[PDB]
């Protein structure tokens, strides 16, 4: 049994991904188009906690404690509490929950919206009292909707900057690539389709290759060709540096949010 | 569905594109490796020996590839095409469909050269990309004057086995080159850079490369499976005050969007130049 | 609908905002001009004499405005608010709703000052903008500790007569200031620049000003009447190879988008500073 | 009776605008959601021309002649031919049509998509054989869906750069303003609503004022305030120059398209 | 002596207002003609005492000195309209942007030989009698014509004779100059408002600062760099501010403007000479 606290864009994404995986029946999950896929709903978080065994929390960082205060009394020995809330630290969750019952089993998750098409990127960190089997169960569950691996909690800020914010970098890139295609005479719908297919195929090539991305870049840029001409104009605008800047900005903002959680 | 489990394919050229197409086609099961022959001027390349291990037939003689083939792919550097056409023109038969992947080389230029030998050559111009090697390529094609309707149908069936494929008017192919032709190199560059940023912020390189590649693959699949605008998805995922909208602002401040427009335009314009450089000679 | 055709409104301040609100309210017919009183320290301003011609009552004495009013708008420079509250605090009655439009001045700071005199002051914080003068303003409000539910309802009815109006949590008002508070100045700047571009390309200035203002008004109305994303509308209107997508590229190359993000952020941050500068004193 | 040749985004926009104006009944217009509002449809341009008195042409520039060749024989004395096609010159239309019948009555229109909410910006130029009453009828028709005025044909390129492309500049601006609002903590939907309302209100203020936009800027920027701080950061990025660059780029591209028409 | 204006735009008004404010001409001796005269320009000119008429030929018949202050591409049309009405007594003074003495003489010479033509590059501050004007004399202008022109244009500001091939550069500098100043003053006022000044005071102080600095330079033998040195105390506010101007290439932007305006003027002279 799984539950969600928050019905944001990441709650639906995970529920859609889990049900599409066939790893969970839609009626064994309740949250606090969901009904269309057969997801029980409620406006009282206490009802989800009662229902749940593994319990997800999807809320804004500054909202989490209020759910914890409300449900803290109902956390049982059986519960694994999995927080996806951006910037909320394991420490802040355990401190709240330990006021009610000692040894809350807490896992901190950093996932992304492509779990909705089962191509997510997820990392997780295990809390003070999570047993070894809890982390293994987490990895098996989140592996059903994409890549999943364990990290130390102090890398989640960096992961956020890369694969957490990554999809938005890609949506920005795909909008611009389609603008470029339209400038050069392509219909908008075809430009969006072609750019998305190019990025998907390149990403899969890299994941299926043992080679460096620079190596694949080299392999595809013929001497004097169209592609190396285009790579030059990327380089002249500092394209690489902007993506480094982005990962860094999102990571650093996550640290500022983690500090507000730990205040 | 058209029956072609018994047709032969040839590549003039044995480089990255010929390898990627042969690998994708055989992995799709639509062609048996022994029905594929590729010819290379320098048969000491890495792509050549990998074609051998696949079971493709390799030869130094372009005429042998022609005599083997029903579908004939031209996958050589562009300024080589006029010499290849002179070399094999008299070996083109009525059965041949000639599929040019040479960037910028136009249908008219190919038909002009081949018409000197036998009238009505069946020519298709293709714009595809290396991710056909994992069957996720992006392919467009344009059909020539003497290409029968069934030739375009066969073309689309074959290239759809290794990725997206659709027919366009020839005058869009230069723009497609700037977008999905060059597209994978833009993504490889972005992925190297994203991984550098992950490493700067403390991730191991191997994990940074894996995470950034998975983010890009997932985002692209989301867009393809959504009816929605990429701006709508950007809005959907960017929580107020959060890490992502902070990172998007630093992308905007460097003109990130404009660089990708610049790239599509430059690749397209260079493709037009190569085509005009061709015809001046 | 709440009956208030018989309540009196007062403005502390008689500047641009007080004029714009009085003009919008009277043009909406929701208030008669003689039910409005405004007080100014310098009654030699242009806004003062225009208020006179409208039929608004003008006075130099802030206490007289308070004794006249049921709804009391504070529309003065921000660092003036502490002195005004000291001056009129003992004149606040149980009937008064105090509506602060002072940028950055927080509900807590106002309630602290007014609580010294009479407990439970009814305070609402407003963030509105000058286009209320043509009844197309953008207004948000936040209700204070002692504001009854009906006070927020009355507030929204009144401010909705002159534009969009909705209730927010107080901690969004700084961001609203950066966006719709300052927004009209960003548009005036853009319209001057657009007109310069029209004149450069040969249009008469008067026509350039009219065309650019109409383009902006129409585009904004389209967005408000569409469910769609502004990126979707940008895609809808940008024909392949056309004039508009060429112009969008030059906007992107200068980081146009990032400048507007920078502007919203700077106005918001300055608004936070003014609020913190307040409380340090 | 009115007809449309092309069912692009501008054909629907005009038909939606005319029907919303009550200046035309939807069934007195045919094109070559339209049926939903009661607009007769057909795939043969010759059928619209037969049906029509005033005849609009909405097609890509490089497509116009093919409609003219197809319908040229059917143009009658009664017809006013109104081209909205981007970059297609009066000269290129009259030259094609005069091969069939002398003295075609041609008007060249530069309108924009906000005609769909009856806030368009339209200019028109009258051709060699348009009578005076034709231009007056045009102005009355296009005034029902926004501002309309006559110009010389050699200003249409400039108008395109300003009010033709203008709405896209505004959609770009509104997306960025909403990104800024979201960065500073606002929900996306509220940020989009507030920014659009701010731009609409500012534009209306300017249209209802006799004052200069600089004058309204001055009137609203209080000393030391939030707004003048934000205006400074616009100025430091050359904000004004980018909008000049845009009007110029769209105008110049229109000239290049007019040259392809006149080749 | 009497003066005519073909054209009633901002520059013909400025000259007419300046000439009348100077008293060198009684306004009833001034005629202006336009096919569509601005609503406020009619009332201002009529209250000024300026005779108004829609027919360019009435202006010509009325005038001894005849200013042409119209959009450049209109000029060939004007010259063909009035060319037959030019007499020996006429001095034709062109203010039209980039219209060359050659293009005017070629047109006028078709009607009567030896048209007396002067080309003028003036600016709008003639309206407050602080204009900057240069002029070039044409092939058949007599020596006394140039003298009369300089005496007239000196009544409303600085005036000196130049070779015609410097008028493009003069356009870039003093012709366009006032607009550079108006742009500068708006920005300086934004800066004053940013730092806490009321808009009205900021506008007044910046305009007064510019006026006084320009007068200092005019009344000085000294280099502008030398005046900059005299007012910049060590470590002070002013040298700090000059540094941030330097870091943005302030000087280069003004050189760019002069050059761009000059070069645009040459493009307009080519169109006239086409």
Swiss-Prot record, chains B, C:
Please give the function described in this protein's UniProt entry. Oxidoreductase that catalyzes the last step in proline biosynthesis, which corresponds to the reduction of pyrroline-5-carboxylate to L-proline using NAD(P)H. At physiologic concentrations, has higher specific activity in the presence of NADH. Involved in the cellular response to oxidative stress.
Which keywords does this chain's UniProt record carry?
Answer: Acetylation, Amino-acid biosynthesis, Disease variant, Mitochondrion, NADP, Oxidoreductase, Phosphoprotein, Proline biosynthesis, Stress response
Specify the superkingdom.
Eukaryota
Q: Say which species the protein is native to.
A: Homo sapiens (Human)
User: Gene3D superfamilies of this UniProt entry?
Assistant: NAD(P)-binding Rossmann-like Domain, ProC C-terminal domain-like
Which residues does the record give as NADPH binding sites? 14, 16-17, 40, 42, 62, 76-77, 103, 236
Disorder noted: Cutis laxa, autosomal recessive, 2B: A disorder characterized by an excessive congenital skin wrinkling, a large fontanelle with delayed closure, a typical facial appearance with downslanting palpebral fissures, a general connective tissue weakness, and varying degrees of growth and developmental delay and neurological abnormalities. Patients do not manifest metabolic abnormalities. Cutis laxa, autosomal recessive, 3B: A disorder characterized by an aged appearance with distinctive facial features, sparse hair, ophthalmologic abnormalities, intrauterine growth retardation, and cutis laxa.
Q: Where this protein primarily resides, as one coarse class?
A: mitochondrion
Protein name in UniProt: Pyrroline-5-carboxylate reductase 1, mitochondrial
Gene name as annotated: PYCR1
